[PDB]
């Protein structure tokens, strides 16, 4: 059954609630982004309206084969009326096409649902600045102080310099980047840009990337592996066995692999700076785990909430254990007392 933290009180609306069959009383289903934990249940046989971003709507049509008549894309940063209710879609700073949703309830309550997001001070000058928010449905993925990680710009610097150095040393080295969903495309696009190459990939993944409205994308990606020295593979092939195998497939064009796994957080972050990251190495293969996050750090999170000053917070992640729920509630109380709302 649909859990409470996916329902919007006083509306006919749910968020990210496609795996529970027909939800009783739901007149419109919102989808925040195209990640399988959130779209779980959609398919070509879905017949209610779906509200979402343009990019999300491209993916639902082309990857899931949802019929066009049920896809309702909305522009970002624009006041729209859905089923008698005013709504705005905001950029989540998550993966391509990801949005937060502002809902203006007919009784005058205002609700923000962040979807998945990486809080940023730029959000403090969106349409959020212009009114009070009563309730916040918050992405609490990393809502603990041990979750620190660097900015995305720092991590991209590290990857660029790393890849440029190795390939300049050895023009016969191949770079591989692991992927399993949309998101984090900056990692492989940055690296291919510094090396003067296109990114090569499967037909399925090229198709997914053709849905995203990225500028000049025909110029950066390809399905011809032979012409590219940056390859993408499934995240599950990013290991010594998978990478030896792939290397054999390139027909002696290459004699070394430098591979990247963009992870969220890894406990190495409590001790080690980005400058100090080192690979796992076996033979002619090295593997780097890089902490490229598309979710808020604890501090980034805390700053957004203290700025927004909500009356009530409803977590949408780590809600399944009493120890989690307790821990989060304690931080929310700390933030409130420190700021004074
Ligand atoms: Ni996500």
All domains of the chain, ordered by start, with CATH?
Answer: 1-147+296-341 (3.60.15.10), 148-295 (3.40.50.12650)
Ligand 1 centre distance from Cα of residue 252 (Å):
38
Ligand 1 centre distance from Cα of residue 183 (Å):
8
Q: Please, are residues 294 and 95 in contact by the beta-carbon 8 Å criterion?
A: yes
Ligand 1 centre distance from Cα of residue 16 (Å):
11
- Of 53, 18, 10, 51, the C-alpha closest to 37 is 18
Residues shown for the chain:
341
Q: What is the DSSP letter of 203?
A: H
Residue the block writes with tokens 């309730």:
135
What percentage of the chain's residues is helix, strand, coil (to nearest 5)? Answer: 35, 20, 45
E strand intervals along 31-154: 50-52, 71-73, 80-82, 85-91, 99-104, 110-113, 135-138
Q: Are strands 13-15 and 312-315 parallel, antiparallel or unpaired?
A: unpaired
What CA–CA distance (Å, rounded) separates 2 from 12?
14
Ligand 1 centre distance from Cα of residue 95 (Å):
7
Tokens found for residue 211: 């849905």
End-to-end, the C-alpha distance of the chain in Å comes to 35
- Of 157, 147, 88, the C-alpha closest to 123 is 88
Q: Is 77 left (phi over 0), alpha (psi -120 to 50) or beta?
A: left
Q: Please, are residues 97 and 59 in contact by the beta-carbon 8 Å criterion?
A: yes
Calculate the alpha carbon distances from 20 to 6, 9, 23, 24, 38 in Å.
Answer: 11, 18, 7, 10, 12
Question: Using N-to-C axis directions, what is the helix angle for 185-195 and 152-169, rounded to 10°?
Answer: 40
Cα four-point dihedral sign 309, 310, 312, 313: negative
Dihedral angle of Cα 233, 237, 243, 245, to the nearest 10 degrees? -100
Q: What is the DSSP letter of 236?
A: G
Strand partners, 113: 101, 137
Calculate the alpha carbon distances from 300 to 112, 118, 128 in Å.
Answer: 17, 8, 17
What CA–CA distance (Å, rounded) separates 101 from 91?
9
Ligand 1 centre distance from Cα of residue 278 (Å):
27
Quote the radius of gyration of the chain (alpha carbons, Å): 22
Q: List residues in the chain that are followed by a break over 2.5 Å (C to N).
A: none
Residue the block writes with tokens 């096409």:
97
- CB burial class (10 A; 0-12, 13-18, 19+) of residue 291? buried
What CA–CA distance (Å, rounded) separates 183 from 34?
10
- Of 45, 43, 7, the C-alpha closest to 28 is 7
Ligand 1 centre distance from Cα of residue 34 (Å):
8
Task: For the beta carbon of residue 148, count every other beta carbon within 10 angstroms.
Answer: 14
Ligand 1 centre distance from Cα of residue 141 (Å):
10
What CA–CA distance (Å, rounded) separates 187 from 182?
12
Ligand 1 centre distance from Cα of residue 35 (Å):
5
Ligand 1 centre distance from Cα of residue 116 (Å):
5
Ligand 1 centre distance from Cα of residue 264 (Å):
11
Q: How far is CA 292 from the centre of its chain?
A: 10
Non-local CB neighbours of 157 within 8 Å, separated by 6+ positions: none
Ligand 1 centre distance from Cα of residue 247 (Å):
31
Can you give the resolution of this entry in Å? Answer: 1.7
Ligand 1 centre distance from Cα of residue 181 (Å):
9
Ligand 1 centre distance from Cα of residue 137 (Å):
15
User: What ranges in the chain are assigned the alpha helix state H?
Assistant: 36-39, 54-62, 152-169, 185-195, 203-210, 240-249, 298-308, 322-339
Strand partners, 230: 175, 199
What CA–CA distance (Å, rounded) separates 31 from 243?
36
- Of 183, 246, 243, the C-alpha closest to 212 is 183
Instruction: Assign 3-class secondary structure to 47-69.
Output: CCCEEECHHHHHHHHHCCCCCHH
Ligand 1 centre distance from Cα of residue 5 (Å):
16
Q: Please, are residues 258 and 166 in contact by the beta-carbon 8 Å criterion?
A: yes
């Amino acid at each position: 059954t649909c859990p409470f933290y996916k329902k919007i009180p006083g509306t006919g609306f749910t968020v990210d609630a496609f795996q529970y069959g027909v939800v009783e009383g739901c007149t419109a289903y919102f989808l925040t982004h195209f990640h399988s934990d959130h779209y779980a249940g959609l398919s070509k046989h879905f017949t209610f309206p779906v509200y979402c971003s343009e990019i999300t709507g491209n993916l639902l049509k082309n990857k899931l084969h949802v019929q066009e008549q049920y896809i309702h894309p909305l522009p970002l940063d624009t006041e729209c009326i859905v089923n008698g209710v005013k709504v705005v879609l905001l950029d989540a700073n998550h993966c391509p096409g990801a949005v937060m949703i502002l809902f203006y309830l007919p009784n005058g309550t205002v609700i923000l649902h962040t979807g998945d997001f990486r809080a940023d001070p730029s959000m403090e000058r969106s349409l959020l600045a212009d009114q009070k928010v009563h309730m916040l449905y918050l992405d609490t993925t990393y809502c603990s102080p041990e979750y620190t990680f660097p900015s995305q710009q720092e991590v991209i610097r590290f990857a660029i310099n790393t890849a440029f150095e190795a390939v300049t040393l050895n023009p016969h080295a191949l770079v591989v980047c692991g992927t399993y969903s949309i998101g984090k495309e900056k990692v492989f696009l940055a690296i291919a840009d510094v090396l003067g190459s296109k990114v090569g990939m499967s037909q399925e993944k090229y198709k997914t990337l053709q849905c995203l409205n990225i500028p000049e994308i025909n110029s950066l990606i390809t399905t011809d592996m032979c012409s590219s020295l940056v390859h993408l593979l499934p995240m599950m092939q990013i290991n010594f066995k998978g990478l030896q195998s792939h290397l054999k497939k390139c027909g002696g064009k290459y004699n070394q692999i430098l591979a990247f796994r963009p992870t969220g957080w890894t406990h190495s972050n409590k001790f080690t700076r980005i400058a100090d990251v080192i690979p796992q190495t076996k033979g002619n293969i090295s593997i780097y785990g890089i902490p490229y996050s598309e979710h808020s750090s604890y501090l980034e999170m805390k700053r957004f909430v203290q700025w927004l000053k909500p009356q009530k917070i409803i977590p949408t992640v780590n809600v399944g254990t009493w120890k989690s729920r307790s821990t989060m509630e304690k931080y929310f109380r700390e933030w409130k007392l420190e700021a004074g709302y």
